[PDB]
Amino acid sequence: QLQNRLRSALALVTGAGSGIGRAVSVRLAGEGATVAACDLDRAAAQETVRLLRGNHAAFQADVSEARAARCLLEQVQACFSRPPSVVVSCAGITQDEFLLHMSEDDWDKVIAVNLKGTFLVTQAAAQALVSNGCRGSIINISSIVGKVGNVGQTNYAASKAGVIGLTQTAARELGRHGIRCNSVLPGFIATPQKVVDKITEMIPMGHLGDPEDVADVVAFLASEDSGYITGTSVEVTGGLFM
Amino acid sequence: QNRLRSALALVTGAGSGIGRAVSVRLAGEGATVAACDLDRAAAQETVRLLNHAAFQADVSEARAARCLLEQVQACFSRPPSVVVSCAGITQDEFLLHMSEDDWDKVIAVNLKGTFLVTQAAAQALVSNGCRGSIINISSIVGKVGNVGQTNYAASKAGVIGLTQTAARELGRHGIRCNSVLPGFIATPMTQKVPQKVVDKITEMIPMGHLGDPEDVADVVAFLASEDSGYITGTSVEVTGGLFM
Amino acid sequence: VFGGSRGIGRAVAQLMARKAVIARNLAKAAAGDLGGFSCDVAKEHDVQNTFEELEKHLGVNFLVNAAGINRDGLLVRTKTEDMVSQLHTNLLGSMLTCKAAMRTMIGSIVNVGSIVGLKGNSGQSVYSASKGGLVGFSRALAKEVARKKIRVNVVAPGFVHTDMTKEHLKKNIPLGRFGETIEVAHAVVFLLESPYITGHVLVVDGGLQLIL
Amino acid sequence: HHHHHMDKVCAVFGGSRGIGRAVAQLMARKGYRLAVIARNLEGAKAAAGDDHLAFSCDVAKEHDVQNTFEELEKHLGRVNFLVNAAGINLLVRTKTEDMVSQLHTNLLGSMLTCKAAMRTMIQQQGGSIVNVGSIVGLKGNSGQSVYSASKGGLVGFSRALAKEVARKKIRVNVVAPGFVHTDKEEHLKKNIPLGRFGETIEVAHAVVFLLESPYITGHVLVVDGGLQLIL
Numbered sequence: 001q002l003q004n005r006l007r008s009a010l011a012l013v014t015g016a017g018s019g020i021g022r023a024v025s026v027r028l029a030g031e032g033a034t035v036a037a038c039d040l041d042r043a044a045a046q047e048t049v050r051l052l053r054g055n056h057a058a059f060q061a062d063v064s065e066a067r068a069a070r071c072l073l074e075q076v077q078a079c080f081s082r083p084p085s086v087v088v089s090c091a092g093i094t095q096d097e098f099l100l101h102m103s104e105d106d107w108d109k110v111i112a113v114n115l116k117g118t119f120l121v122t123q124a125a126a127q128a129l130v131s132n133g134c135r136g137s138i139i140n141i142s143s144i145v146g147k148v149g150n151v152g153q154t155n156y157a158a159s160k161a162g163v164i165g166l167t168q169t170a171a172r173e174l175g176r177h178g179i180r181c182n183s184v185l186p187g188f189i190a191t192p193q194k195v196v197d198k199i200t201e202m203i204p205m206g207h208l209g210d211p212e213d214v215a216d217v218v219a220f221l222a223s224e225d226s227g228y229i230t231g232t233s234v235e236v237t238g239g240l241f242m
Numbered sequence: 243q244n245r246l247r248s249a250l251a252l253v254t255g256a257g258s259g260i261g262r263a264v265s266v267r268l269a270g271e272g273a274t275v276a277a278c279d280l281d282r283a284a285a286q287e288t289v290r291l292l293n294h295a296a297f298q299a300d301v302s303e304a305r306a307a308r309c310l311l312e313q314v315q316a317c318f319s320r321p322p323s324v325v326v327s328c329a330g331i332t333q334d335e336f337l338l339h340m341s342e343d344d345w346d347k348v349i350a351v352n353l354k355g356t357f358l359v360t361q362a363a364a365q366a367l368v369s370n371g372c373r374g375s376i377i378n379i380s381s382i383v384g385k386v387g388n389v390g391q392t393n394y395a396a397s398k399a400g401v402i403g404l405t406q407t408a409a410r411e412l413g414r415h416g417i418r419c420n421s422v423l424p425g426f427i428a429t430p431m432t433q434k435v436p437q438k439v440v441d442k443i444t445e446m447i448p449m450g451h452l453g454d455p456e457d458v459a460d461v462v463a464f465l466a467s468e469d470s471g472y473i474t475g476t477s478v479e480v481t482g483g484l485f486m
Numbered sequence: 487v488f489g490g491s492r493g494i495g496r497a498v499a500q501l502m503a504r505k506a507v508i509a510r511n512l513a514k515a516a517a518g519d520l521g522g523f524s525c526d527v528a529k530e531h532d533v534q535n536t537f538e539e540l541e542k543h544l545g546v547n548f549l550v551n552a553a554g555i556n557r558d559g560l561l562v563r564t565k566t567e568d569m570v571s572q573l574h575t576n577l578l579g580s581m582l583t584c585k586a587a588m589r590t591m592i593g594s595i596v597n598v599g600s601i602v603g604l605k606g607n608s609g610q611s612v613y614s615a616s617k618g619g620l621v622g623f624s625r626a627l628a629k630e631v632a633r634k635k636i637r638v639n640v641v642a643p644g645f646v647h648t649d650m651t652k653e654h655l656k657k658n659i660p661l662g663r664f665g666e667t668i669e670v671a672h673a674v675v676f677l678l679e680s681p682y683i684t685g686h687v688l689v690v691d692g693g694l695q696l697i698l
Numbered sequence: 699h700h701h702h703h704m705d706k707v708c709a710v711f712g713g714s715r716g717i718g719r720a721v722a723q724l725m726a727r728k729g730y731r732l733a734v735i736a737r738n739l740e741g742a743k744a745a746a747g748d749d750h751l752a753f754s755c756d757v758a759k760e761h762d763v764q765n766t767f768e769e770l771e772k773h774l775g776r777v778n779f780l781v782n783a784a785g786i787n788l789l790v791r792t793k794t795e796d797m798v799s800q801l802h803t804n805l806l807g808s809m810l811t812c813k814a815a816m817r818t819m820i821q822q823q824g825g826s827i828v829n830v831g832s833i834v835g836l837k838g839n840s841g842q843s844v845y846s847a848s849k850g851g852l853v854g855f856s857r858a859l860a861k862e863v864a865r866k867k868i869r870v871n872v873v874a875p876g877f878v879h880t881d882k883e884e885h886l887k888k889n890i891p892l893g894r895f896g897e898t899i900e901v902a903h904a905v906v907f908l909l910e911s912p913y914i915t916g917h918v919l920v921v922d923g924g925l926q927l928i929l
């Protein structure tokens with residue numbers, strides 16, 4: 001109903017193998033957007049494509065690696081003869097550990113994927129749109145943890161908080177080029193027991209969010225309706241840490 | 243013999259700018275400052291301005307970070323009750339032209355470096371059951387971002403979320419973790435900014451002038467003292483009104 | 487939509503009609519071309535006299551507060567007569583609205599604030615104190631009513647006009663020029679139709695938030 | 699402070715209250731010539747004696763603030779330090795009489811106070827103002843809807859006033875206390891990082907700090923022990 005506001009949009013979603021990333025690909029394709037799925041597992045990304053008309057295609061690339069990130073954008077422009085006007089970074093992982101006992105591996109792995117991974121994707125996408133004189137909307141997922149912090153997630157909170165500052169900078173430089181850059185702040189989403197029940201009572205609404213609800217704001221920020229919203233962080237926490 | 247008489251201060255990057263001003267400010271409060279810096283020549287230069295001791299360590303390295311807290315704790319026979327991370331660099335370039343080297347450099351030093359220093363210091367305090375304050379110097383750029391500083395903003399914004407996390411875990415042990423968000427300060431780091439651009443920023447700043455590294459050191463001295471005993475997991479802004 | 491005769495109020499009404507106008511001056515002109523009254527924000531009894539008209543006419547799923555007055559002036563030049571005015575209109579006016587709308591909805595409310603209510607602005611002392619109060623007010627109301635399947639939010643637009651430079655304050659804005667009422671209205675309908683989003687202050691920015 | 703002429707004159711509205719006393723006591727040992735002022739003259743007189751002056755005022759009434767400001771100035775001199783610590787604390791339960799009341803003494807009370815202060819601070823081209831708010835003004839809290847709006851508008855007001863008069867070498871700052879012992883809790887303190895409620899003097903040091911920082915204006919210094927991270 002009154003959807004398909006992205007009929008002429010090429011959507012690139014990193015980490016669209018499962019959870020939120022897959023849910024975003026469904027929401028965008030539901031609005032007639034040619035979704036370009038990207039994930040570490042090729043089989044997982046190709047499965048998402050099957051769950052979607054627009055002759056979609058899946059791609060395998062490690063967002064943490066600079067080579068795989070640049071090769072990702074080149075393959076998209078070679079498969080659709082145009083750069084992705086819609087880029088959403090959902091590729092991220094969690095490796096929780098106490099600060100007093102957090103190994104260097106737990107730190108580097110999260111930073112490289114969540115922060116550095118977002119940087120390489122956002123950069124290569126920006127370089128693509130500007131060089132072709134195309135206008136677009138870059139979206140980056142940064143949890144509510146990366147704003148207030150959470151116990152056991154020193155590497156995760158710093159990475160997600162860095163994404164916000166990363167996006168706010170990009171939104172300032174790419175503002176002249178007509179490229180909007182925003183951030184999304186999801187709460188706790190039921191994605192792949194006792195700890196969960198305690199988290200629900202803490203949330204003002206009293207329940208975990210859905211990956212579909214996270215794809216709602218993404219569909220808005222990538223559309224023409226949000227054409228004056230750039231450098232803004234949106235919270236989808238259900239009232240948590242408001 | 244003053245405010246911070248019994249305090250042992252560990253200040254990384256205390257060889258220049260704010261780190262040197264912090265060392266002077268804290269030493270004026272009667273504290274023995276352990277000036278750490280990547281350059282030993284500039285580290286000894288700070289000690290001569292202030293028993294005090296100089297240390298050479300690269301905060302981006304895990305080996306140099308662990309050993310730093312090992313050398314200090316074994317030199318003063320006690321863990322640093324005050325930990326001030328001022329070790330930071332600037333490798334600014336536009337987003338469309340920023341190389342991978344420009345990215346990893348700042349992140350490893352400003353973001354990862356702060357982590358390793360904060361972590362090892364936290365481990366040193368708890369191991370001895372000692373209470374203290376961890377002060378990480380972020381920036382106003384870490385809240386709003388800045389042109390050419392895609393890697394710098396991502397590192398400074400990361401410090402905030404890093405410190406807030408540590409404040410939630412080290413609160414039960416008696417270790418307060420705070421963040422400082424200074425504006426454009428009259429430091430050698432801002433000397434890399436063209437004079438015509440400095441004047442333009444000077445106009446943008448509501449107070450109408452650049453900040454002094456002692457003003458930032460005044461905040462650090464307050465966060466290190468027991469006057470801010472109920473202050474933790476916050477972000478103090480020394481911007482002079484800029485980007486408020 | 488409170489104050490839906492002019493400004494962003496009508497814009498919200500138009501975008502919502504495409505998918506009950508409450509303004510001070512009869513306000514019927516907007517109803518002549520929109521699907522789906524007179525009231526002032528200052529007087530509570532007048533607000534109650536309007537919410538009572540809702541039961542007979544429709545019988546209040548969404549509530550939008552877009553009514554407000556913005557007169558610039560220095561603090562020393564500003565008199566008490568206008569200090570109370572904007573406060574009872576932009577702040578208290580929204581407080582009395584959400585209260586009477588709390589009788590029903592047992593819901594989604596969106597309060598139109600401003601970027602100056604969070605970051606401040608020169609010559610706009612009272613207006614910043616007005617649009618800034620509804621920020622924390624919505625935060626507190628959200629925590630208290632979120633379990634009631636009711637969600638309150640805040641829209642904080644930047645510089646809203648027909649790209650009126652200032653002069654020339656559009657060059658400082660990263661996104662070309664000023665924003666329009668229609669674009670701000672798209673944010674209001676968004677927050678109203680977005681589940682699991684409450685107590686959030688969405689900023690119709692344009693890059694202005696990054697600076698003063 | 700000084701070595702002769704007490705050129706450091708501070709005015710702490712609600713100085714007889716909890717937060718007001720801790721500020722008036724701390725600045726007295728630093729060399730600041732203060733003026734304990736509240737709604738109760740007797741409560742302000744005792745606080746002053748236990749030199750310093752005492753005044754009686756109601757921040758809600760406008761002509762009462764302007765009257766006291768001139769009365770305060772004539773007995774101590776030009777005031778270059780202002781501390782507003784005179785604030786008071788459900789849905790479809792609160793009468794409109796209560797709303798307008800605490801929206802005048804908490805928000806408008808500080809606005810009228812800052813207004814009268816700018817008539818002497820701008821001429822002298824110097825001064826520093828600290829307004830007492832809360833995290834509830836920003837993050838909000840259940841049951842305190844109206845109180846959240848009062849301390850919330852104070853944030854936007856001060857920052858707007860900060861940028862307006864900053865070129866006059868005048869700083870306007872905000873403090874945001876969490877939970878304090880003034881005039882259930884164990885389960886709430888368990889969530890708080892430090893694990894305790896804030897003391898009155900702990901807020902005072904944060905106020906004085908902002909009064910003495912020559913490059914901090916329009917900043918909301920939150921003192922909650924990490925409470926803003928759990929709620």
Ligand SMILES: NC(=O)c1ccc[n+]([C@@H]2O[C@H](COP(=O)([O-])OP(=O)(O)OC[C@H]3O[C@@H](n4cnc5c(N)ncnc54)[C@H](O)[C@@H]3O)[C@@H](O)[C@H]2O)c1
Pocket residue numbers: 014015016017018019020021022038039040041044061062063064090091092093113117141142143144186187188189190191192
């Ligand atoms: N509940 C939550 O887990 C939660 C809450 C708020 C925000 N977020 C954030 O939202 C984003 C989406 O989360 P999710 O629910 O999909 O989590 P998820 O566990 O479902 O994500 C795992 C997927 O990410 C992909 N991935 C991880 N690292 C990668 C890399 N370097 N290169 C390519 N692909 C990679 C994997 O292929 C995998 O399919 C995450 O980045 C997360 O940080 C998550």
Ligand SMILES: NC(=O)c1ccc[n+]([C@@H]2O[C@H](COP(=O)([O-])OP(=O)(O)OC[C@H]3O[C@@H](n4cnc5c(N)ncnc54)[C@H](O)[C@@H]3O)[C@@H](O)[C@H]2O)c1
Pocket residue numbers: 254255256257258259260261262278279280281284299300301302327328329330331351352355379380381382423424425426427428429430431432
């Ligand atoms: N100066 C400003 O305008 C400003 C503004 C906001 C934030 N900051 C932050 O405050 C901190 C203090 O900066 P400053 O003004 O003293 O700048 P500065 O240029 O004076 O500081 C440079 C010092 O940091 C040390 N250093 C750099 N990398 C290091 C590493 N890997 N390990 C150990 N030491 C290292 C160097 O030895 C040098 O002495 C910085 O981290 C900066 O990010 C500064």
